[PDB]
Ligand binder design. Sequence first.
Ligand SMILES: Nc1ncnc2c1ncn2[C@H]1CNC[C@@H](COS(=O)(=O)NC(=O)CCCC[C@@H]2SC[C@@H]3NC(=O)N[C@@H]32)O1
Length: 263
Amino acid sequence: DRDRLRPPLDERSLRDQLIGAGSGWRQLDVVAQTGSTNADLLARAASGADIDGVVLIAEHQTAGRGRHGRGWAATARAQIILSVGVRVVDVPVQAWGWLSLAAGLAVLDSVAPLIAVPPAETGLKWPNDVLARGGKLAGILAEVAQPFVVLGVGLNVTQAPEEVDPDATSLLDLGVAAPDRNRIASRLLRELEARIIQWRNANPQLAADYRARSLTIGSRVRVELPGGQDVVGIARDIDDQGRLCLDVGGRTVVVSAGDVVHL
Ligand SMILES: Nc1ncnc2c1ncn2[C@H]1CNC[C@@H](COS(=O)(=O)NC(=O)CCCC[C@@H]2SC[C@@H]3NC(=O)N[C@@H]32)O1
């Protein structure tokens, strides 16, 4: 059973590795349990905390939140569940969508080398679902608390799909025999720091790297839009606002938000 593969995080070691000269992370806490790490960081910002470069990791999360008012499920120590704060006020608002795409890229790049063979449908589903073998390996949620965005990552490490969602997968289920969450969390946060810096500086490599890992671009898709309408087309590109560009029988439709199904 998977619980024998879920030792606790080592908070001291993470701080040792991630906080100090050369690193932009300013604070890191591991809590045993909370409702929602995104909610917690937002609440800190709401009461005046400077949450830029602040990391909050929860071993367990009981009232997790997904995009568009959905949920996120977890069992204790089975995921890496974290939120970070990012000051965004210095960047034009039209570019903030790319911060969420950057986070997906970082999560993917941090775990991709751990999988034995790269199986089909492994990469990013727009916006930033991390997929492996067509299963959802991580979900990312970005929320605003001016002058910040809070980025939240739920990454299935040993999480069983029946525990959370039938379309989920985990590093364990992909063949990582003994995943080390301290190693993985450190890699994730180092990748994320670089991608946040690229985003802040409008580095073209961010969009290029996102395209290189996109499962959505080039695919026939059905996109379920907020408001409950569907559009079926072929995904062609992402624009400068991080929006999905669809070819719908020769007519272009640009979507800011939606649920993508690869057909
Ligand atoms: N562990 C699962 N694996 C894979 N699929 C799942 C799982 N738990 C439900 N799901 C499914 C169930 N249906 C809804 C769906 C929500 O998907 S969603 O709209 O694309 N949103 C997301 O994927 C964003 C999720 C962000 C979660 C992080 S955890 C740390 C932070 N704090 C917080 O409250 N939210 C963020 O997730």
